């Protein structure tokens, strides 16, 4: 009996969010997709025949990577009042990956609901349409909802990578910088690295086609499939190990004599002319970022969407929410 | 300067093996693909316009999963003398994954070369066409070419899984058995589990379509997309953790009240009504299996195809080969 979970349903509507892996959801009048990560689009394919509401970047990926039929894809602009089945909704930048959004639902009866999808809370969100009215219910990405989860800011990670890469290529003009990636994400990191080095980013034709879906301005002048004309390469995450990088260095035919690689997980692992830096890159809120966003939003009700498998996890999170509400006075 | 490595070239011919990620390989007259693993087919797509020689199962996957054009796919039968560009070749079962083959090349000048692709050496190979003549050069999958690498036989792993599953469902008829999988592989494990339980294997429509490509006899009577009509489910490897399995148990709506899961890596990790067994499943030769195969084949020359990134690794392997040759007297 495949059952869609509670945290994927929008109360007072027939709306679901990221609920494509349960077959036909009874009484669902509109299916939203917050972003193009396989955990969330799972189940979508060329055989799907209900309307999918999503951002334009997400729509491009649905069309070109999953071959969802164009007639069922309903892309919506960001930061704009839109209507779906008589209900007003706004898509907000989730600061997660390209095309990723939070969804703000304005119920005709006056209730206002935010579904964050996956997000990394940011002070800029306090400047968004969220500011213009009271938000009653919050469906919250609680991936790192525990005080242990501390990591640097996105800008700190990018600054570290820029500095490390610039210095390494300064000391050795024959060095190659490698960034590991999945299908999307990390664009701001590897584009900044290539920028400081005055280089395009080299990659496979498949990764190149993927980046064409992302509406990045002037993208063709930033990326190339001609690998050996660049100083920065993208490789699959699973190749970022000494064996995989030695192999890539051999594959480049002597054009480079050293690789410096970054991967998400600071002192590098070094074996000869290969070095690997694990960087604390994250597409989700830290505990403190999350706490700040929630104390600013002051929702009446919070529904966690992640780590809700046991009672202990759910109740520990409810405890933090009560403490937050007490300290901020709502 | 993208360069195809030496271990992917067949000497005395214009043949390459699993060399699709280097653009046009200069002077390559025929491209072989040993099996459908992304490390090996990497680079293949609908835009490829040279002939690809492979098994029929691999050909099905190329056509239906990668949309390689049918006119460039050249499937060949197993255990059968075939001709490619005037050269006689045989495809042999590699005992690796469905459709995976080793390739035996019969050069017009009398030289005989075996490329194992990925393989798990088996005594049955000693009964193959390999027996009928002397093999001069061996391009060897050396994934676990180190004495530390010991693990049970495939039959021992399958027997353990059958027994554990049968006993768990005997003690609790409401339990669910889960097997984690990538795109292909492990069929003999999860089909045997379902067999002993008198059940079909439930799975997503995507995994169902994949298994239809594998020429498994009577397959439609062994698998289903109607999950809750079965006792054995397949999930993505990355979902095989307590959070992912708790979530799946919720998704099944109370049909089951317990999950017992197997994954490749014996005492289970248990948290309440979820248990996870790491099983030492392998699609590659153990050190001892490899040693036995090579001492039986007695090749004049061995060329390792894996772990050849450093001199230390290459020379350590050459040392084992010399010791093997000395002990067996060739
Ligand atoms: Zn995500
Ligand atoms: Zn393989």
PDB file of C-alpha atoms in Angstrom, chain B residues 150-275:
ATOM      1  CA  UNK B 150      39.969 -12.917   0.922  1.00  0.00           C
ATOM      2  CA  UNK B 151      36.222 -13.276   0.844  1.00  0.00           C
ATOM      3  CA  UNK B 152      33.734 -16.143   0.626  1.00  0.00           C
ATOM      4  CA  UNK B 153      32.548 -17.722  -2.587  1.00  0.00           C
ATOM      5  CA  UNK B 154      29.500 -16.449  -4.429  1.00  0.00           C
ATOM      6  CA  UNK B 155      27.583 -19.588  -3.399  1.00  0.00           C
ATOM      7  CA  UNK B 156      28.487 -19.073   0.273  1.00  0.00           C
ATOM      8  CA  UNK B 157      27.170 -15.492   0.161  1.00  0.00           C
ATOM      9  CA  UNK B 158      23.951 -16.595  -1.528  1.00  0.00           C
ATOM     10  CA  UNK B 159      23.485 -19.481   0.947  1.00  0.00           C
ATOM     11  CA  UNK B 160      23.888 -17.136   3.920  1.00  0.00           C
ATOM     12  CA  UNK B 161      21.301 -14.748   2.449  1.00  0.00           C
ATOM     13  CA  UNK B 162      18.787 -17.479   1.689  1.00  0.00           C
ATOM     14  CA  UNK B 163      19.070 -18.944   5.209  1.00  0.00           C
ATOM     15  CA  UNK B 164      18.910 -15.596   7.008  1.00  0.00           C
ATOM     16  CA  UNK B 165      15.878 -14.463   4.992  1.00  0.00           C
ATOM     17  CA  UNK B 166      13.993 -17.749   5.322  1.00  0.00           C
ATOM     18  CA  UNK B 167      14.496 -17.816   9.079  1.00  0.00           C
ATOM     19  CA  UNK B 168      13.529 -14.137   9.550  1.00  0.00           C
ATOM     20  CA  UNK B 169      10.244 -14.475   7.629  1.00  0.00           C
ATOM     21  CA  UNK B 170       9.547 -17.782   9.396  1.00  0.00           C
ATOM     22  CA  UNK B 171       9.836 -16.009  12.763  1.00  0.00           C
ATOM     23  CA  UNK B 172       7.809 -13.033  11.462  1.00  0.00           C
ATOM     24  CA  UNK B 173       5.491 -13.484   8.457  1.00  0.00           C
ATOM     25  CA  UNK B 174       4.993  -9.685   8.444  1.00  0.00           C
ATOM     26  CA  UNK B 175       8.663  -8.941   7.822  1.00  0.00           C
ATOM     27  CA  UNK B 176      10.046  -7.447   4.565  1.00  0.00           C
ATOM     28  CA  UNK B 177      13.379  -8.404   3.015  1.00  0.00           C
ATOM     29  CA  UNK B 178      15.242  -5.644   1.168  1.00  0.00           C
ATOM     30  CA  UNK B 179      18.177  -5.909  -1.132  1.00  0.00           C
ATOM     31  CA  UNK B 180      20.206  -2.816  -2.121  1.00  0.00           C
ATOM     32  CA  UNK B 181      21.316  -2.594  -5.747  1.00  0.00           C
ATOM     33  CA  UNK B 182      22.874  -0.317  -8.344  1.00  0.00           C
ATOM     34  CA  UNK B 183      21.583  -0.499 -11.937  1.00  0.00           C
ATOM     35  CA  UNK B 184      22.543  -4.166 -12.590  1.00  0.00           C
ATOM     36  CA  UNK B 185      24.201  -6.994 -10.627  1.00  0.00           C
ATOM     37  CA  UNK B 186      23.165  -9.138  -7.608  1.00  0.00           C
ATOM     38  CA  UNK B 187      20.337 -10.822  -9.558  1.00  0.00           C
ATOM     39  CA  UNK B 188      21.464 -14.270  -8.431  1.00  0.00           C
ATOM     40  CA  UNK B 189      21.330 -13.083  -4.844  1.00  0.00           C
ATOM     41  CA  UNK B 190      17.912 -11.445  -4.755  1.00  0.00           C
ATOM     42  CA  UNK B 191      16.260 -13.953  -7.100  1.00  0.00           C
ATOM     43  CA  UNK B 192      17.432 -16.789  -4.841  1.00  0.00           C
ATOM     44  CA  UNK B 193      16.063 -14.995  -1.765  1.00  0.00           C
ATOM     45  CA  UNK B 194      12.653 -14.508  -3.395  1.00  0.00           C
ATOM     46  CA  UNK B 195      12.664 -18.133  -4.574  1.00  0.00           C
ATOM     47  CA  UNK B 196      13.141 -19.591  -1.072  1.00  0.00           C
ATOM     48  CA  UNK B 197      10.322 -17.293   0.147  1.00  0.00           C
ATOM     49  CA  UNK B 198       7.955 -18.170  -2.712  1.00  0.00           C
ATOM     50  CA  UNK B 199       7.736 -14.560  -3.783  1.00  0.00           C
ATOM     51  CA  UNK B 200       8.290 -12.235  -6.689  1.00  0.00           C
ATOM     52  CA  UNK B 201      10.774  -9.365  -6.329  1.00  0.00           C
ATOM     53  CA  UNK B 202       9.108  -5.938  -6.118  1.00  0.00           C
ATOM     54  CA  UNK B 203      10.841  -2.867  -7.579  1.00  0.00           C
ATOM     55  CA  UNK B 204      10.416   0.518  -9.323  1.00  0.00           C
ATOM     56  CA  UNK B 205       9.331   0.769 -12.966  1.00  0.00           C
ATOM     57  CA  UNK B 206      12.832   1.948 -13.858  1.00  0.00           C
ATOM     58  CA  UNK B 207      14.534  -1.088 -12.274  1.00  0.00           C
ATOM     59  CA  UNK B 208      11.845  -3.293 -13.857  1.00  0.00           C
ATOM     60  CA  UNK B 209      12.657  -1.927 -17.330  1.00  0.00           C
ATOM     61  CA  UNK B 210      16.354  -2.540 -16.733  1.00  0.00           C
ATOM     62  CA  UNK B 211      15.819  -6.202 -15.832  1.00  0.00           C
ATOM     63  CA  UNK B 212      13.751  -6.711 -19.009  1.00  0.00           C
ATOM     64  CA  UNK B 213      16.973  -6.090 -20.977  1.00  0.00           C
ATOM     65  CA  UNK B 214      18.751  -9.088 -19.447  1.00  0.00           C
ATOM     66  CA  UNK B 215      17.258 -12.060 -21.339  1.00  0.00           C
ATOM     67  CA  UNK B 216      16.319 -13.767 -18.068  1.00  0.00           C
ATOM     68  CA  UNK B 217      13.934 -16.618 -18.909  1.00  0.00           C
ATOM     69  CA  UNK B 218      10.394 -16.215 -17.552  1.00  0.00           C
ATOM     70  CA  UNK B 219      11.476 -12.921 -15.953  1.00  0.00           C
ATOM     71  CA  UNK B 220       7.912 -11.524 -15.842  1.00  0.00           C
ATOM     72  CA  UNK B 221       6.972 -14.308 -13.436  1.00  0.00           C
ATOM     73  CA  UNK B 222       9.858 -13.419 -11.085  1.00  0.00           C
ATOM     74  CA  UNK B 223       9.541  -9.633 -10.770  1.00  0.00           C
ATOM     75  CA  UNK B 224       6.762  -7.056 -10.314  1.00  0.00           C
ATOM     76  CA  UNK B 225       6.174  -3.328  -9.853  1.00  0.00           C
ATOM     77  CA  UNK B 226       3.317  -4.113  -7.464  1.00  0.00           C
ATOM     78  CA  UNK B 227       5.490  -3.778  -4.349  1.00  0.00           C
ATOM     79  CA  UNK B 228       3.055  -4.799  -1.642  1.00  0.00           C
ATOM     80  CA  UNK B 229       2.297  -8.093  -3.350  1.00  0.00           C
ATOM     81  CA  UNK B 230       5.869  -9.242  -2.598  1.00  0.00           C
ATOM     82  CA  UNK B 231       8.147 -10.196   0.312  1.00  0.00           C
ATOM     83  CA  UNK B 232      11.386  -8.946  -1.254  1.00  0.00           C
ATOM     84  CA  UNK B 233      12.008  -5.360  -2.425  1.00  0.00           C
ATOM     85  CA  UNK B 234      14.917  -3.741  -4.279  1.00  0.00           C
ATOM     86  CA  UNK B 235      16.042  -0.272  -3.203  1.00  0.00           C
ATOM     87  CA  UNK B 236      18.892   1.988  -4.381  1.00  0.00           C
ATOM     88  CA  UNK B 237      22.135   1.176  -2.583  1.00  0.00           C
ATOM     89  CA  UNK B 238      22.220   4.623  -0.953  1.00  0.00           C
ATOM     90  CA  UNK B 239      18.857   4.071   0.744  1.00  0.00           C
ATOM     91  CA  UNK B 240      20.214   1.065   2.687  1.00  0.00           C
ATOM     92  CA  UNK B 241      20.601   2.846   6.034  1.00  0.00           C
ATOM     93  CA  UNK B 242      18.286   3.193   9.025  1.00  0.00           C
ATOM     94  CA  UNK B 243      16.835   6.507   7.885  1.00  0.00           C
ATOM     95  CA  UNK B 244      16.151   5.266   4.349  1.00  0.00           C
ATOM     96  CA  UNK B 245      14.687   1.963   5.532  1.00  0.00           C
ATOM     97  CA  UNK B 246      12.470   3.561   8.234  1.00  0.00           C
ATOM     98  CA  UNK B 247      11.186   5.778   5.437  1.00  0.00           C
ATOM     99  CA  UNK B 248      10.464   2.767   3.177  1.00  0.00           C
ATOM    100  CA  UNK B 249       8.642   0.979   5.980  1.00  0.00           C
ATOM    101  CA  UNK B 250       6.435   4.071   6.384  1.00  0.00           C
ATOM    102  CA  UNK B 251       5.932   4.193   2.599  1.00  0.00           C
ATOM    103  CA  UNK B 252       4.550   0.608   2.609  1.00  0.00           C
ATOM    104  CA  UNK B 253       1.689   1.775   4.823  1.00  0.00           C
ATOM    105  CA  UNK B 254       1.749  -0.840   7.557  1.00  0.00           C
ATOM    106  CA  UNK B 255       1.742  -3.825   5.176  1.00  0.00           C
ATOM    107  CA  UNK B 256       5.032  -4.864   6.844  1.00  0.00           C
ATOM    108  CA  UNK B 257       6.253  -4.194  10.392  1.00  0.00           C
ATOM    109  CA  UNK B 258       9.903  -5.192  10.049  1.00  0.00           C
ATOM    110  CA  UNK B 259      12.709  -4.881   7.503  1.00  0.00           C
ATOM    111  CA  UNK B 260      15.719  -7.114   7.124  1.00  0.00           C
ATOM    112  CA  UNK B 261      18.140  -5.611   4.575  1.00  0.00           C
ATOM    113  CA  UNK B 262      21.267  -6.866   2.814  1.00  0.00           C
ATOM    114  CA  UNK B 263      24.009  -4.720   1.332  1.00  0.00           C
ATOM    115  CA  UNK B 264      27.470  -5.440  -0.106  1.00  0.00           C
ATOM    116  CA  UNK B 265      30.476  -4.496   2.032  1.00  0.00           C
ATOM    117  CA  UNK B 266      28.572 -11.727  10.064  1.00  0.00           C
ATOM    118  CA  UNK B 267      26.711  -9.649  12.654  1.00  0.00           C
ATOM    119  CA  UNK B 268      23.885  -7.233  11.699  1.00  0.00           C
ATOM    120  CA  UNK B 269      23.395  -3.616  12.716  1.00  0.00           C
ATOM    121  CA  UNK B 270      20.020  -3.546  14.477  1.00  0.00           C
ATOM    122  CA  UNK B 271      17.867  -0.589  15.547  1.00  0.00           C
ATOM    123  CA  UNK B 272      14.478  -1.848  16.664  1.00  0.00           C
ATOM    124  CA  UNK B 273      12.550  -3.455  13.821  1.00  0.00           C
ATOM    125  CA  UNK B 274      15.204  -2.643  11.209  1.00  0.00           C
ATOM    126  CA  UNK B 275      18.271  -4.835  10.674  1.00  0.00           C
TER     127      UNK B 275
END
